Amino acid sequence: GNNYSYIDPTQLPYDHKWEFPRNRLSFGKTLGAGKVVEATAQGLIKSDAAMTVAVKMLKPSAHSTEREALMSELKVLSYLGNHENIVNLLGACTHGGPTLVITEYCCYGDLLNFLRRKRDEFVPDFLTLEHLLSFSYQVAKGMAFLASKNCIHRDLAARNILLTHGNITKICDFARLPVKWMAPESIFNSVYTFESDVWSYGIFLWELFSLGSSPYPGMPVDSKFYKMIKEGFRMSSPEYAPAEMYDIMKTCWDADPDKRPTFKQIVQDIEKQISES
Ligand SMILES: Cn1cc(-c2ccc(CNc3cc(-c4cnc5cc(OCCCN6CCCC6)ccn45)ncn3)cc2)cn1
Ligand SMILES: [Cl-]
């Protein structure tokens, strides 16, 4: 009770093993916007070698609470540790300021823009169906890893999944809310859990197997949208979605969060699909 408590990663001190000289960073083009830029890190991993990285930083007009928020994200990434399917922390510039968060660089960018570019050149260097099951499998693995560290993402979507060399997908994270990806309990009661992440993973699967279509097409976010979602309206199967994968989406979209599968259940379900190829 009083003697045993969860260890809040945002309350732990910043570990200076991540500290990197900011004069060894040369910023390039902006990757996204709290902007993220491409940069060359001189001597980051090897002393005599430059390395392309991504650097997250706040807008110059960010105030006191925004500055501490970026530090908390840094501490969470440090507490999570390295994993194959997340955009891994590589270093930070914290002395003096402004805080710079150095992470892995993924040359292909976000998965949503990637799928829309490969939309034509798709057949079940060509995007295929084996890639789509691999992508769905790797994202569930990363989310299972997050769930194992008592961390929920709260903005899982194709736009927050990056692609790098070797077709490795990595989970990342770039008030206004992503309504069409949110579980009903998040929209109506503002609660976020492991299960609401699973709901968003189901929406991600629909983006993936439709080659990047916007979810709920032709439906604006309005009174009719909320009414239909609450009454049980769900999207139908995407054009390129296997039957066993659509069965997963339906379970992720269960109105009862306790009936939704866990990411640990999802990974081994997709494992049996890949195995029986
Ligand atoms: C599990 N979990 C992870 C976090 C997490 C991790 C990391 C962070 C900060 N780091 C980043 C990094 C990048 C990034 C890396 N590589 C690219 C490459 C890009 O595109 C270039 C390709 C050009 N286009 C392609 C063709 C046309 C032009 C774009 C962005 N990125 N994006 C955002 N934040 C924050 C949170 C939180 N929970
Ligand atoms: Cl907890």
Q: Whose CA is nearest to atom 21 of ligand 1?
A: 109
Alpha-carbon torsion (222, 227, 232, 233), positive or negative: negative
User: In angstroms, rounded to a whole number, what is the distance separating the alpha carbons of residues 218 and 201?
Assistant: 21
| Residues in a beta bridge with 103 | 54, 89
User: In angstroms, rounded to a whole number, what is the distance separating the alpha carbons of residues 133 and 131?
Assistant: 6
User: In angstroms, rounded to a whole number, what is the distance separating the alpha carbons of residues 267 and 210?
Assistant: 21
Sorted by sequence, the CB contacts under 8 Å of residue 123 that are 6+ apart come out as none
Mutating to test ligand 1, I would choose from 27, 36, 113 the residue with most ligand atoms within 8 A of its C-beta, which is 36
Report the 10 Å Cβ neighbour count for 68: 11
User: In angstroms, rounded to a whole number, what is the distance separating the alpha carbons of residues 180 and 137?
Assistant: 22
Q: Whose CA is nearest to atom 34 of ligand 1?
A: 174
Mutating to test ligand 1, I would choose from 40, 71, 86, 162 the residue with most ligand atoms within 8 A of its C-beta, which is 162
Closest by CA to 104, choosing from 56, 70, 63, is 56
Q: Are 87 and 183 in contact (CB under 8 A)?
A: no
Closest by CA to 23, choosing from 1, 40, 6, is 40
Dihedral through CA 143, CA 256, CA 181, CA 233, nearest 10? 140
User: In angstroms, rounded to a whole number, what is the distance separating the alpha carbons of residues 74 and 12?
Assistant: 11
Closest by CA to 271, choosing from 151, 143, 140, 178, is 140
How deeply is 259 buried, as exposed, middle or buried, from its count of CB atoms within 10 A (0-12, 13-18, 19+)? exposed
Which numeric CATH code is attached to 109-272? 1.10.510.10
How deeply is 80 buried, as exposed, middle or buried, from its count of CB atoms within 10 A (0-12, 13-18, 19+)? middle
88 C-alpha vs ligand 2 centroid, how far in Å?
Answer: 23
**Resolution of the experimentally solved model in angstroms:** 2.0
Q: Encoding tokens for residue 48?
A: 């005599």
- For residue 247, indicate whether it is catalytic: no
Technique used to solve these coordinates: X-ray
Q: In 3-state terms, what secondary structure has residue 253? A: coil
Q: Encoding tokens for residue 99?
A: 């805080």
User: In angstroms, rounded to a whole number, what is the distance separating the alpha carbons of residues 158 and 191?
Assistant: 22
| Residues in a beta bridge with 65 | none
Q: Whose CA is nearest to atom 22 of ligand 1?
A: 109
| Residues in a beta bridge with 51 | 41
Around ligand 1, the residues with Cβ closer than 6 Å are 31-32, 36, 54, 56, 73, 77, 86-87, 101, 103, 105-106, 109, 146, 153, 162, 171-174
How deeply is 131 buried, as exposed, middle or buried, from its count of CB atoms within 10 A (0-12, 13-18, 19+)? middle
Q: Whose CA is nearest to atom 13 of ligand 1?
A: 54
CATH topology of domain 9-103: Phosphorylase Kinase; domain 1 (3.30.200)
Query: Given its phi and psi angles, is residue 171 left (phi above 0), alpha (psi -120 to 50 degrees) or beta?
Result: beta
Query: Could you tell me the residue ranges of all domains in the chain?
Result: 9-103, 109-272
Q: Are 160 and 173 in contact (CB under 8 A)?
A: yes
Q: Which ligand is nearest to the CA of 194?
A: 2
Is residue 216 a known part of a binding site?
no
Angle between helices 263-275 and 129-148 (to 10 degrees): 150
Q: In 3-state terms, what secondary structure has residue 178? A: coil
With vertex at residue 243, the alpha carbon angle to CA 239 and CA 246, rounded to the nearest 5 degrees, is: 75
Sorted by sequence, the CB contacts under 8 Å of residue 219 that are 6+ apart come out as 225, 228
268 C-alpha vs ligand 2 centroid, how far in Å?
Answer: 25
118 C-alpha vs ligand 1 centroid, how far in Å?
Answer: 19
Is residue 106 a known part of a binding site?
yes
Indicate which residue of 15, 120, 155, 247 is catalytic: 155
Q: Which ligand is nearest to the CA of 73?
A: 1
Q: In 3-state terms, what secondary structure has residue 39? A: strand
One-letter amino acid identity for 59?
A: K
Rg (Cα) of the chain, in Å, rounded?
20
Closest by CA to 177, choosing from 155, 204, 196, 200, is 155
Report the 10 Å Cβ neighbour count for 241: 21
What DSSP string runs through 71-111? HHHHHHHHHH---TTB--EEEEE-SSS--EEEE---TTEEH
Closest by CA to 89, choosing from 98, 72, 99, 76, is 76
User: In angstroms, rounded to a whole number, what is the distance separating the alpha carbons of residues 120 and 128?
Assistant: 11
